Structure 1
């Protein structure tokens, strides 16, 4: 198999840069249209991160910053599969997450929300997908939190995630939410996404058979990255 370029990103499946309802986007969006280019080696390559570098608790947000006790909040496991748009598993992709604690508070001086800080919670994790594109991490369910867009704006609970995979063209950062959260329908950031089917693609689903008794609940959440097409005639990449 000789690989060609990544399929074109479908702009209608993503938020536009300028989205007036999310006020901070007004001064941080280009006024010119993006210039599309034909891909070269630069866009179809990406770095490799070796497993050797990761610690044993890197994907365990419950214990990786625990000092005297366990963090307070709902114990949850989140797992799922990373695949490309043609359904192929994405192997050894770097998945990084960051989030607030159970009160909706981030661990930084910049966050001044009255929600209480948890001395035993850090809120950062990372993992590599396996050969089937599978990933799993454990954490405390984040609390929703207020922010100033309109004065009484509130984000639904969410976990921020980032992926570095096989090609630079696949680089993606987003946020996933939890099935049933009522704030999901009111969030101006989630509403920047044009279609309802794509908004639903960011909702992690309750996976009841995978709860661990007297221990943790579990959510299922799959991620799809852009896929490369195979070449059977002229290979112009180079």
Structure 2
């Protein structure tokens, strides 16, 4: 079983978005009004699931092939790859990375998305993988289109891919969104702007990565993820 043998650097909750960011309208009634209660790290917080023994299908990381209903999905073929490290720069190997997204037209394969842009019969929009022994992950997919949404009267999400990363403990687990280099919708989005610090926003922008492209085939973007720094315990209970 799991043991308590590490501590995780405390989060900077001014680097993360705050709970109440009213321009993102749904945050108004879904943000606690009382202060969070700080608690010390115990085995409950410094452990978490490891997914080495989860059985992955052959195409789980490949959205060009994992919803195959007779052809390839339409849209910009791209690899999305990167490394997961902690704040001390240490790679996070064998960690679960999950992603989901709209299709090339900004339409989600979810019963609750009724945007008029069509579904793609060969695109599902979900991927997962484990980072390798050096911390690297990769997916193959279609670049998602911007998605209009009922916030302000003319609000559009930038092209984006949702990410979840497990990391070594429940204290490191993170959900975030990847955006794409140069997208002029990024500075306009109230969800992006839930993050107050412009330097933090930049950490969510994947860069075009020609070095990793397959010529005559697919482009590539690089998106690195940094989880909370992990250290050994020291001088505790003495």
Q: Same fold (TM over 0.5)?
A: yes
Deviation at residue 52 of structure 1 after TM alignment: 5.3
- Counterpart Cα distance in 2 of 1:3 and 1:43: 11
The 3-state SS of whatever aligns with 2:117 is coil
Are 2:41 and 1:39 aligned?
yes
Deviation at residue 211 of structure 1 after TM alignment: 1.3
- Counterpart Cα distance in 2 of 1:76 and 1:34: 40
The 3-state SS of whatever aligns with 1:170 is coil
User: Which residue number in structure 1 is paired with residue 161 of structure 2?
Assistant: 159
Are 2:19 and 1:7 aligned?
no
Q: Are the equivalent residues in 2 in contact too, given 1:3–1:228 (CA < 8 A)?
A: no
Aligned with residue 210 of structure 1, among 204, 209, 212? 212
The 3-state SS of whatever aligns with 2:171 is helix
Aligned with residue 114 of structure 2, among 105, 112, 115? 112
Query: Which stretches in structure 1 are left out of the alignment for 5+ residues?
Result: none
After TM superposition, the structure 1 = structure 2 runs for residues 1-238 of structure 1, keeping only pairs within 5 Å, are: 3-51=5-53, 53-234=55-236
Deviation at residue 51 of structure 1 after TM alignment: 4.7
Query: Which stretches in structure 2 are left out of the alignment for 5+ residues?
Result: none
| TM-score in terms of structure 1 length | 0.96
- Counterpart Cα distance in 1 of 2:60 and 2:237: 40
- Change in 2 beyond 3 A, CA 1:109/1:231: closer
RMSD value, Cα: 1.3
| TM-score in terms of structure 2 length | 0.96
Q: How many residues are aligned here?
A: 235
By percentage of residues, which structure has more helix?
1
Deviation at residue 235 of structure 1 after TM alignment: 5.9
- Change in 2 beyond 3 A, CA 1:4/1:69: closer
- Counterpart Cα distance in 2 of 1:52 and 1:8: 29
Q: Are the equivalent residues in 2 in contact too, given 1:176–1:204 (CA < 8 A)?
A: yes
Deviation at residue 50 of structure 1 after TM alignment: 2.9
